[PDB]
Amino acid sequence: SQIRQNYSTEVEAAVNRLVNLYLRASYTYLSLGFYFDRDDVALEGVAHFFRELAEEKREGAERLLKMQNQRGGRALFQDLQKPSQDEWGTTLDAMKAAIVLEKSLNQALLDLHALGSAQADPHLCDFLESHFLDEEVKLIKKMGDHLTNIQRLVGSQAGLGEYLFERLTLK
Amino acid sequence: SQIRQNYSTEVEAAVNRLVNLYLRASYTYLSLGFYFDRDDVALEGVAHFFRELAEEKREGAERLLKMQNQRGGRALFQDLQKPSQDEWGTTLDAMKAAIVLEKSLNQALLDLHALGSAQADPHLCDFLESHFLDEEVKLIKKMGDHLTNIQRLVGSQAGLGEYLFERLTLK
Amino acid sequence: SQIRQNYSTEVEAAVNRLVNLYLRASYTYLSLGFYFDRDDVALEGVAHFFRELAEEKREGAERLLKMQNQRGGRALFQDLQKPSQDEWGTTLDAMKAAIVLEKSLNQALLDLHALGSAQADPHLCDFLESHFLDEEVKLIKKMGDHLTNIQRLVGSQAGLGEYLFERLTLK
Amino acid sequence: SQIRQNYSTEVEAAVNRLVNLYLRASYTYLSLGFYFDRDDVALEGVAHFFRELAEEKREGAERLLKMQNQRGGRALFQDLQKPSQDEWGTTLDAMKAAIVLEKSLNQALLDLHALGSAQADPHLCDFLESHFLDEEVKLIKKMGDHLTNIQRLVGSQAGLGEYLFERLTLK
Amino acid sequence: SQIRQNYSTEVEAAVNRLVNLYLRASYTYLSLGFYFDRDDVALEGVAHFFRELAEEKREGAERLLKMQNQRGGRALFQDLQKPSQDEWGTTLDAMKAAIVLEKSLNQALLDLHALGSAQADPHLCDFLESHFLDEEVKLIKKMGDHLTNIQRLVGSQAGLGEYLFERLTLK
Ligand SMILES: [Pd+2]
Ligand SMILES: [Pd+2]
Ligand SMILES: [Pd+2]
Ligand SMILES: [Pd+2]
Ligand SMILES: [Pd+2]
């Protein structure tokens, strides 16, 4: 590289790790998306919600990789761990798992921003805010809103509430 | 016929039987369709679902008959057995009966494809795949999805669940 | 599942393995795509070629997963092995690696088709032909065409030939 | 025939021979066209050039046959000799072979025109000029132009020159 | 000024210096742009590339001056040093000089951002990121990409490579 400037080896490594985290998250959402498409689950709005998230996280990884090259860093890929579950339970179980996942990505972004601040790397810190940190806050708020509505619908008839949420809130 | 080539008498007979099965299935769906239009049943989305299926199965029979003539075989019609029930119970009962019916048609198609493979009749085997086997897989998946949603809606208030499914999923 | 019919456990497992192979191939093409975007490589047409392939292979995996659910099988994900190289050499080296990769996917599809034929599963065999086997033949022919043109351009001035191929054949 | 007038048996026979020559030329160009589409040759602009010529020569034969009937002569077909080569070498080799072929067709047209002049058959002589002799002069000039550019591109790097000609002059 | 708030004399002075650096860079690119328009150089795509950069850097200076006034600081102009060379050598020489120039501007922006961070001036730091630091990263990546392609084209025939790069990559 003849372009690298103010781009630390620590940040370069952390960016590669964040790419792996984003790709893992995409893979997790892919699994969630197909689980809700199972004939014995059959909640299309829920499937669509997670399938859209799979694509968003893949896009996030690609944006990070583009930035790595723009800065003169070098992409290094690692194995992608399979998702933590094969079956994801109820919509409530899935939304809880999704919020946990998003909080972990958000924390990884915050950790990287902190490293950028420590390294005096303003291009990095601003890139993370613009493309990632703002989107995370919005997504987490939406999931929290969803969790609240799912929870209020459990009542004594969980099946009815699960159907209604998918029909009236999602897709 | 001056056109028949590679078209066995076994396949010709099996095609005629499949026509009868398709016409029977259309007749069954016609009965289902009008049952759900009864003033004391009154589930329009369910009626429409079965009425559409009646037309699809009739169309399938006509396609088989066209193919029979294209191959130089001769259509032979048999009596059409009246449907197995006069009254079809709940939406759940009806969807269960519809899945059973579709699985029987699918098995008849698979049996015919096997005969085509045994007879080295690739035009037949491909015709069945293109117009029938793919459609069956899609339809059966949709019915399974429907059954799952119907089942989750039973709860303690079957009437409420039946109304909601018709209103929010169907027609 | 209340829909599964004529869908063997052997095929279901093989479909899950093929999904992993497609996702691995997508990951490989993602790496190839970003390698050619490096400031010290800088062959945009080559990067774009591999980035498009990454998306095609991801789409292929998603189609396989949709089919798995349509048949009543259950998606099971495994770890995704990181790509075989971190740096991909010349356009020629990369195109050779891509052809090798495509031949491996093609062989996996052929192996699965053979299993489908052995299991008398015509829906599976036709699905593979329509969405995968035809596309593979076309893609492999295109890569072979590319390899030939790359090879004729090496001459005594490899740099010149590499630039011209990217400029005049690709993107 | 109740229409034949001023149309000699010599011309009628020569027209049938010219049809055979045109059909042979079409067959030759068909072979050339597919040779350049081989994955180990892969020069699309060259393939397209010869494929277009195959269609032009076929069209020429059909025009001659229409004229034969317009004059009250009778089409008589002979075997079509397979093309002189199975593999056509370089673009230069192929263009040289194509010019040789065109000169032979041009000479056959000139020989027929001479026969028409000898037989005082002005409809024939004008038909040949309008549909064939003018087109031949234009095509031969274009091939000569191509040969010159191909030849100047050989240099010390034949592969580079062959690629550039296909990319920058053809299709 | 009745508007100045949180705007240090150190930042105000540094902004004036950055204006001078931007105007100097514009002047350098103006010289580069006209050099490549010389009849004995005659590389229009290269001239256009540098002429566009001259305008971009002038625009950058004007944006800085507008910001200085928005904050209540006072523009102070200094002499503009003539560019470091009268003749710029090859496209490769020029692109190397341009990357050096951009890295110096980028470092000046980073130094100013650091001063803004030290002075707790978030309006300044964000202004620099938005209008300057992001653009610099993109421009430097593009120049690095260009340098790589120029370098691969040198081979044994520098003239040929220089012509091809101007024709096929630039303007
Ligand atoms: Pd920061
Ligand atoms: Pd078959
Ligand atoms: Pd098959
Ligand atoms: Pd004449
Ligand atoms: Pd700041």
mmCIF file of N, CA and C in Angstrom, chain C residues 74-165:
data_model
loop_
_atom_site.group_PDB
_atom_site.id
_atom_site.type_symbol
_atom_site.label_atom_id
_atom_site.label_comp_id
_atom_site.label_asym_id
_atom_site.label_seq_id
_atom_site.Cartn_x
_atom_site.Cartn_y
_atom_site.Cartn_z
ATOM 1 N N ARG C 74 -35.217 -29.904 6.983
ATOM 2 C CA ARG C 74 -34.848 -28.913 7.981
ATOM 3 C C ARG C 74 -33.433 -28.438 7.752
ATOM 4 N N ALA C 75 -33.300 -27.124 7.578
ATOM 5 C CA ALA C 75 -31.995 -26.487 7.409
ATOM 6 C C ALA C 75 -31.121 -26.745 8.635
ATOM 7 N N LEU C 76 -29.890 -27.157 8.384
ATOM 8 C CA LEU C 76 -28.914 -27.303 9.452
ATOM 9 C C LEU C 76 -27.644 -26.663 8.940
ATOM 10 N N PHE C 77 -27.178 -25.651 9.661
ATOM 11 C CA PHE C 77 -26.010 -24.895 9.231
ATOM 12 C C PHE C 77 -24.748 -25.406 9.919
ATOM 13 N N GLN C 78 -23.623 -25.312 9.220
ATOM 14 C CA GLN C 78 -22.316 -25.626 9.791
ATOM 15 C C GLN C 78 -21.397 -24.424 9.671
ATOM 16 N N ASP C 79 -20.261 -24.475 10.368
ATOM 17 C CA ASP C 79 -19.272 -23.400 10.248
ATOM 18 C C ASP C 79 -18.909 -23.212 8.801
ATOM 19 N N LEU C 80 -18.625 -21.966 8.437
ATOM 20 C CA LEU C 80 -18.131 -21.680 7.105
ATOM 21 C C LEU C 80 -16.636 -21.533 7.164
ATOM 22 N N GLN C 81 -15.939 -22.448 6.509
ATOM 23 C CA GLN C 81 -14.498 -22.398 6.422
ATOM 24 C C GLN C 81 -14.081 -21.123 5.721
ATOM 25 N N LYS C 82 -13.061 -20.446 6.246
ATOM 26 C CA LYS C 82 -12.526 -19.261 5.566
ATOM 27 C C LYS C 82 -11.949 -19.694 4.207
ATOM 28 N N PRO C 83 -11.869 -18.757 3.248
ATOM 29 C CA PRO C 83 -11.317 -19.132 1.933
ATOM 30 C C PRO C 83 -9.886 -19.639 2.011
ATOM 31 N N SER C 84 -9.508 -20.438 1.017
ATOM 32 C CA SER C 84 -8.225 -21.138 0.990
ATOM 33 C C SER C 84 -6.994 -20.223 0.922
ATOM 34 N N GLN C 85 -7.170 -18.994 0.444
ATOM 35 C CA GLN C 85 -6.065 -18.040 0.360
ATOM 36 C C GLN C 85 -6.461 -16.689 0.930
ATOM 37 N N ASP C 86 -5.463 -15.933 1.392
ATOM 38 C CA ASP C 86 -5.682 -14.557 1.839
ATOM 39 C C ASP C 86 -5.381 -13.568 0.709
ATOM 40 N N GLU C 87 -4.462 -13.961 -0.179
ATOM 41 C CA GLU C 87 -4.051 -13.162 -1.366
ATOM 42 C C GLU C 87 -4.117 -14.057 -2.596
ATOM 43 N N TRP C 88 -4.623 -13.530 -3.711
ATOM 44 C CA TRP C 88 -5.040 -14.388 -4.825
ATOM 45 C C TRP C 88 -4.174 -14.307 -6.081
ATOM 46 N N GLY C 89 -3.057 -13.588 -5.983
ATOM 47 C CA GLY C 89 -2.085 -13.550 -7.085
ATOM 48 C C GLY C 89 -2.585 -12.727 -8.254
ATOM 49 N N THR C 90 -2.334 -13.227 -9.455
ATOM 50 C CA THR C 90 -2.693 -12.497 -10.670
ATOM 51 C C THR C 90 -4.145 -12.782 -11.049
ATOM 52 N N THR C 91 -4.674 -12.030 -12.017
ATOM 53 C CA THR C 91 -6.008 -12.332 -12.560
ATOM 54 C C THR C 91 -6.034 -13.773 -13.054
ATOM 55 N N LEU C 92 -4.943 -14.202 -13.689
ATOM 56 C CA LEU C 92 -4.863 -15.575 -14.179
ATOM 57 C C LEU C 92 -4.974 -16.570 -13.019
ATOM 58 N N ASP C 93 -4.212 -16.327 -11.945
ATOM 59 C CA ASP C 93 -4.251 -17.208 -10.769
ATOM 60 C C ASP C 93 -5.680 -17.288 -10.222
ATOM 61 N N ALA C 94 -6.323 -16.127 -10.139
ATOM 62 C CA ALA C 94 -7.670 -16.033 -9.582
ATOM 63 C C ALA C 94 -8.692 -16.760 -10.450
ATOM 64 N N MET C 95 -8.618 -16.563 -11.764
ATOM 65 C CA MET C 95 -9.559 -17.222 -12.680
ATOM 66 C C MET C 95 -9.372 -18.741 -12.651
ATOM 67 N N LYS C 96 -8.118 -19.204 -12.556
ATOM 68 C CA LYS C 96 -7.851 -20.648 -12.394
ATOM 69 C C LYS C 96 -8.497 -21.197 -11.111
ATOM 70 N N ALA C 97 -8.323 -20.472 -10.001
ATOM 71 C CA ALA C 97 -8.943 -20.853 -8.723
ATOM 72 C C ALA C 97 -10.475 -20.843 -8.809
ATOM 73 N N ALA C 98 -11.025 -19.880 -9.547
ATOM 74 C CA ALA C 98 -12.478 -19.785 -9.700
ATOM 75 C C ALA C 98 -13.026 -20.957 -10.505
ATOM 76 N N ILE C 99 -12.316 -21.372 -11.556
ATOM 77 C CA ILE C 99 -12.763 -22.520 -12.359
ATOM 78 C C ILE C 99 -12.728 -23.798 -11.535
ATOM 79 N N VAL C 100 -11.679 -23.933 -10.732
ATOM 80 C CA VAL C 100 -11.545 -25.102 -9.853
ATOM 81 C C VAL C 100 -12.742 -25.148 -8.892
ATOM 82 N N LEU C 101 -13.060 -23.992 -8.318
ATOM 83 C CA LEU C 101 -14.179 -23.858 -7.375
ATOM 84 C C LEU C 101 -15.503 -24.222 -8.056
ATOM 85 N N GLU C 102 -15.720 -23.697 -9.259
ATOM 86 C CA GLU C 102 -16.966 -23.985 -9.973
ATOM 87 C C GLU C 102 -17.096 -25.459 -10.341
ATOM 88 N N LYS C 103 -15.993 -26.075 -10.753
ATOM 89 C CA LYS C 103 -16.022 -27.504 -11.060
ATOM 90 C C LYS C 103 -16.386 -28.321 -9.817
ATOM 91 N N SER C 104 -15.907 -27.893 -8.652
ATOM 92 C CA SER C 104 -16.250 -28.609 -7.407
ATOM 93 C C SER C 104 -17.741 -28.481 -7.061
ATOM 94 N N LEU C 105 -18.310 -27.295 -7.286
ATOM 95 C CA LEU C 105 -19.740 -27.080 -7.056
ATOM 96 C C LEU C 105 -20.554 -27.889 -8.063
ATOM 97 N N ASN C 106 -20.126 -27.847 -9.322
ATOM 98 C CA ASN C 106 -20.788 -28.618 -10.381
ATOM 99 C C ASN C 106 -20.782 -30.104 -10.032
ATOM 100 N N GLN C 107 -19.646 -30.620 -9.553
ATOM 101 C CA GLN C 107 -19.572 -32.044 -9.191
ATOM 102 C C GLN C 107 -20.490 -32.367 -8.021
ATOM 103 N N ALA C 108 -20.563 -31.455 -7.051
ATOM 104 C CA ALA C 108 -21.471 -31.641 -5.920
ATOM 105 C C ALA C 108 -22.927 -31.671 -6.391
ATOM 106 N N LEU C 109 -23.286 -30.783 -7.322
ATOM 107 C CA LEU C 109 -24.640 -30.806 -7.919
ATOM 108 C C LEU C 109 -24.913 -32.131 -8.654
ATOM 109 N N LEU C 110 -23.940 -32.583 -9.438
ATOM 110 C CA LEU C 110 -24.087 -33.848 -10.172
ATOM 111 C C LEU C 110 -24.237 -35.025 -9.194
ATOM 112 N N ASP C 111 -23.444 -35.017 -8.124
ATOM 113 C CA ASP C 111 -23.536 -36.070 -7.108
ATOM 114 C C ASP C 111 -24.936 -36.078 -6.488
ATOM 115 N N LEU C 112 -25.456 -34.885 -6.181
ATOM 116 C CA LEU C 112 -26.805 -34.777 -5.608
ATOM 117 C C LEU C 112 -27.881 -35.217 -6.603
ATOM 118 N N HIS C 113 -27.721 -34.853 -7.881
ATOM 119 C CA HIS C 113 -28.684 -35.271 -8.896
ATOM 120 C C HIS C 113 -28.718 -36.802 -8.977
ATOM 121 N N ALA C 114 -27.535 -37.410 -8.889
ATOM 122 C CA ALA C 114 -27.400 -38.865 -8.959
ATOM 123 C C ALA C 114 -28.130 -39.518 -7.796
ATOM 124 N N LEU C 115 -27.970 -38.930 -6.609
ATOM 125 C CA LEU C 115 -28.672 -39.377 -5.408
ATOM 126 C C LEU C 115 -30.189 -39.242 -5.590
ATOM 127 N N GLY C 116 -30.623 -38.116 -6.153
ATOM 128 C CA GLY C 116 -32.039 -37.917 -6.469
ATOM 129 C C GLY C 116 -32.567 -38.958 -7.439
ATOM 130 N N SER C 117 -31.763 -39.296 -8.443
ATOM 131 C CA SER C 117 -32.147 -40.318 -9.405
ATOM 132 C C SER C 117 -32.250 -41.679 -8.705
ATOM 133 N N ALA C 118 -31.248 -42.012 -7.888
ATOM 134 C CA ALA C 118 -31.237 -43.238 -7.087
ATOM 135 C C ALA C 118 -32.437 -43.337 -6.136
ATOM 136 N N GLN C 119 -32.840 -42.202 -5.571
ATOM 137 C CA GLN C 119 -33.948 -42.150 -4.613
ATOM 138 C C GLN C 119 -35.313 -41.950 -5.299
ATOM 139 N N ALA C 120 -35.329 -41.892 -6.632
ATOM 140 C CA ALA C 120 -36.537 -41.573 -7.415
ATOM 141 C C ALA C 120 -37.217 -40.277 -6.928
ATOM 142 N N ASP C 121 -36.429 -39.204 -6.872
ATOM 143 C CA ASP C 121 -36.906 -37.885 -6.419
ATOM 144 C C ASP C 121 -36.872 -36.907 -7.596
ATOM 145 N N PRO C 122 -37.899 -36.943 -8.493
ATOM 146 C CA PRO C 122 -37.828 -36.059 -9.663
ATOM 147 C C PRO C 122 -37.942 -34.561 -9.365
ATOM 148 N N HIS C 123 -38.639 -34.176 -8.296
ATOM 149 C CA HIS C 123 -38.721 -32.740 -7.988
ATOM 150 C C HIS C 123 -37.320 -32.211 -7.696
ATOM 151 N N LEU C 124 -36.562 -32.975 -6.926
ATOM 152 C CA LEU C 124 -35.202 -32.558 -6.578
ATOM 153 C C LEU C 124 -34.325 -32.467 -7.821
ATOM 154 N N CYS C 125 -34.355 -33.510 -8.648
ATOM 155 C CA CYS C 125 -33.452 -33.567 -9.786
ATOM 156 C C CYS C 125 -33.722 -32.413 -10.759
ATOM 157 N N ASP C 126 -34.994 -32.113 -10.992
ATOM 158 C CA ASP C 126 -35.366 -31.015 -11.865
ATOM 159 C C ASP C 126 -35.022 -29.636 -11.281
ATOM 160 N N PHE C 127 -35.198 -29.494 -9.975
ATOM 161 C CA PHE C 127 -34.862 -28.249 -9.288
ATOM 162 C C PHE C 127 -33.367 -27.929 -9.468
ATOM 163 N N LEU C 128 -32.538 -28.954 -9.301
ATOM 164 C CA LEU C 128 -31.092 -28.795 -9.435
ATOM 165 C C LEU C 128 -30.709 -28.437 -10.863
ATOM 166 N N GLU C 129 -31.377 -29.057 -11.829
ATOM 167 C CA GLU C 129 -31.045 -28.772 -13.217
ATOM 168 C C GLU C 129 -31.382 -27.333 -13.554
ATOM 169 N N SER C 130 -32.608 -26.945 -13.208
ATOM 170 C CA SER C 130 -33.164 -25.638 -13.573
ATOM 171 C C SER C 130 -32.421 -24.466 -12.955
ATOM 172 N N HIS C 131 -32.141 -24.566 -11.663
ATOM 173 C CA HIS C 131 -31.547 -23.432 -10.963
ATOM 174 C C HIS C 131 -30.017 -23.450 -10.863
ATOM 175 N N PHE C 132 -29.394 -24.598 -11.143
ATOM 176 C CA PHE C 132 -27.995 -24.775 -10.803
ATOM 177 C C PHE C 132 -27.142 -25.366 -11.910
ATOM 178 N N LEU C 133 -27.508 -26.556 -12.376
ATOM 179 C CA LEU C 133 -26.683 -27.224 -13.385
ATOM 180 C C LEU C 133 -26.539 -26.425 -14.694
ATOM 181 N N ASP C 134 -27.618 -25.796 -15.176
ATOM 182 C CA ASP C 134 -27.549 -24.988 -16.399
ATOM 183 C C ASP C 134 -26.664 -23.760 -16.177
ATOM 184 N N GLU C 135 -26.845 -23.110 -15.033
ATOM 185 C CA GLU C 135 -26.068 -21.920 -14.710
ATOM 186 C C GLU C 135 -24.588 -22.255 -14.601
ATOM 187 N N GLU C 136 -24.274 -23.400 -13.990
ATOM 188 C CA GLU C 136 -22.881 -23.836 -13.867
ATOM 189 C C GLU C 136 -22.242 -24.035 -15.232
ATOM 190 N N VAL C 137 -22.935 -24.714 -16.141
ATOM 191 C CA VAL C 137 -22.332 -24.923 -17.472
ATOM 192 C C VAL C 137 -22.012 -23.576 -18.129
ATOM 193 N N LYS C 138 -22.959 -22.651 -18.060
ATOM 194 C CA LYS C 138 -22.752 -21.318 -18.658
ATOM 195 C C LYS C 138 -21.598 -20.567 -17.996
ATOM 196 N N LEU C 139 -21.522 -20.632 -16.667
ATOM 197 C CA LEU C 139 -20.487 -19.894 -15.941
ATOM 198 C C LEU C 139 -19.095 -20.470 -16.225
ATOM 199 N N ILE C 140 -18.994 -21.799 -16.221
ATOM 200 C CA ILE C 140 -17.729 -22.461 -16.482
ATOM 201 C C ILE C 140 -17.231 -22.165 -17.907
ATOM 202 N N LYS C 141 -18.150 -22.139 -18.876
ATOM 203 C CA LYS C 141 -17.773 -21.788 -20.255
ATOM 204 C C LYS C 141 -17.207 -20.368 -20.309
ATOM 205 N N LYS C 142 -17.891 -19.435 -19.651
ATOM 206 C CA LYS C 142 -17.427 -18.040 -19.558
ATOM 207 C C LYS C 142 -16.046 -17.952 -18.906
ATOM 208 N N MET C 143 -15.836 -18.654 -17.787
ATOM 209 C CA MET C 143 -14.498 -18.675 -17.177
ATOM 210 C C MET C 143 -13.433 -19.285 -18.057
ATOM 211 N N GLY C 144 -13.779 -20.340 -18.792
ATOM 212 C CA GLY C 144 -12.820 -20.945 -19.704
ATOM 213 C C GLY C 144 -12.438 -19.954 -20.799
ATOM 214 N N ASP C 145 -13.446 -19.254 -21.323
ATOM 215 C CA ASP C 145 -13.239 -18.203 -22.338
ATOM 216 C C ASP C 145 -12.297 -17.131 -21.776
ATOM 217 N N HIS C 146 -12.580 -16.701 -20.550
ATOM 218 C CA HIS C 146 -11.717 -15.720 -19.879
ATOM 219 C C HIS C 146 -10.299 -16.204 -19.704
ATOM 220 N N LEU C 147 -10.130 -17.435 -19.207
ATOM 221 C CA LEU C 147 -8.789 -18.014 -19.048
ATOM 222 C C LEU C 147 -7.995 -18.001 -20.349
ATOM 223 N N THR C 148 -8.659 -18.380 -21.444
ATOM 224 C CA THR C 148 -7.998 -18.380 -22.749
ATOM 225 C C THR C 148 -7.508 -16.994 -23.154
ATOM 226 N N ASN C 149 -8.350 -15.994 -22.967
ATOM 227 C CA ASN C 149 -7.970 -14.626 -23.309
ATOM 228 C C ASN C 149 -6.884 -14.078 -22.387
ATOM 229 N N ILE C 150 -7.004 -14.356 -21.095
ATOM 230 C CA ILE C 150 -5.943 -13.986 -20.145
ATOM 231 C C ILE C 150 -4.607 -14.603 -20.574
ATOM 232 N N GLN C 151 -4.621 -15.903 -20.881
ATOM 233 C CA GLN C 151 -3.412 -16.646 -21.263
ATOM 234 C C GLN C 151 -2.782 -16.085 -22.547
ATOM 235 N N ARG C 152 -3.614 -15.726 -23.521
ATOM 236 C CA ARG C 152 -3.048 -15.187 -24.759
ATOM 237 C C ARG C 152 -2.426 -13.808 -24.539
ATOM 238 N N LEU C 153 -2.858 -13.102 -23.500
ATOM 239 C CA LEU C 153 -2.365 -11.756 -23.197
ATOM 240 C C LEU C 153 -1.094 -11.697 -22.354
ATOM 241 N N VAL C 154 -0.647 -12.835 -21.825
ATOM 242 C CA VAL C 154 0.554 -12.833 -20.980
ATOM 243 C C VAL C 154 1.780 -12.364 -21.779
ATOM 244 N N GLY C 155 2.033 -13.026 -22.908
ATOM 245 C CA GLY C 155 3.130 -12.646 -23.802
ATOM 246 C C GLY C 155 4.433 -12.461 -23.047
ATOM 247 N N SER C 156 5.122 -11.359 -23.343
ATOM 248 C CA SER C 156 6.320 -10.945 -22.597
ATOM 249 C C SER C 156 6.008 -9.807 -21.616
ATOM 250 N N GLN C 157 4.818 -9.212 -21.744
ATOM 251 C CA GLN C 157 4.436 -8.087 -20.892
ATOM 252 C C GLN C 157 3.148 -8.403 -20.150
ATOM 253 N N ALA C 158 3.295 -9.125 -19.042
ATOM 254 C CA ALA C 158 2.158 -9.589 -18.254
ATOM 255 C C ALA C 158 1.326 -8.432 -17.714
ATOM 256 N N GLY C 159 1.992 -7.381 -17.229
ATOM 257 C CA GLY C 159 1.297 -6.184 -16.713
ATOM 258 C C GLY C 159 0.377 -5.540 -17.747
ATOM 259 N N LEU C 160 0.915 -5.299 -18.934
ATOM 260 C CA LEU C 160 0.126 -4.772 -20.034
ATOM 261 C C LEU C 160 -1.088 -5.662 -20.342
ATOM 262 N N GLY C 161 -0.862 -6.970 -20.442
ATOM 263 C CA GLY C 161 -1.955 -7.910 -20.747
ATOM 264 C C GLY C 161 -3.007 -7.914 -19.647
ATOM 265 N N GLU C 162 -2.569 -7.846 -18.398
ATOM 266 C CA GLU C 162 -3.525 -7.850 -17.282
ATOM 267 C C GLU C 162 -4.423 -6.608 -17.265
ATOM 268 N N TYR C 163 -3.804 -5.459 -17.520
ATOM 269 C CA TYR C 163 -4.537 -4.200 -17.626
ATOM 270 C C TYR C 163 -5.525 -4.257 -18.789
ATOM 271 N N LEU C 164 -5.071 -4.704 -19.966
ATOM 272 C CA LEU C 164 -5.947 -4.716 -21.142
ATOM 273 C C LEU C 164 -7.162 -5.632 -20.989
ATOM 274 N N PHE C 165 -6.956 -6.787 -20.376
ATOM 275 C CA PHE C 165 -8.063 -7.728 -20.175
ATOM 276 C C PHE C 165 -9.107 -7.100 -19.261
#
